[PDB]
Amino acid sequence: QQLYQQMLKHNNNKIMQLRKICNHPFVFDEVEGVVNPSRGNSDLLFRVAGKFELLDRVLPKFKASGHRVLMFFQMTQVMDIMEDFLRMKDLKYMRLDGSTKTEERT
C-alpha cells in the first residue's frame, strides 16, 4: 500500500514499478534489504505481498485436494520468489523459462 502510494507519487516505472511491487515488493532488492536485512526465507516474504497470502489460501488446500497447477509470470524475482514460497511451504515444483536450455526443457 505504501510502496504503491509512495511510488504512485514518486513517479515507465509508473506502470512497471507499480507492477513490480504489486507482484511482490522484494523484486526491488533494496526494499528487501530494508524490510528484512537478513534476506532469509522469513514469513515476511508472505506478509509483504497479498498475492502470495492468496497462494497460502490456495496452494495448500490445492495440493491437499490432489490437483496440479500451471502459472505464468514476468521474469526475474517475480518467479524466483515463487521458488522460495514453494520451498517454504514444501510445495514441490519445477521452473521453466527463456534462460533454460532445450535439454532440460524436454
Binding site: Q1, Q2, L3, Q6, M7, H10, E30, V31, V34, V35
Partner: peptide
C-alpha cells in the same frame, strides 16, 4: 503499515 520509519527511507 507498521515500520514506516525505515520505509520512509527506502522510498528514496
Amino acid at each position: 503499515k507498521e515500520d514506516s520509519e525505515p520505509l520512509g527511507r527506502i522510498r528514496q
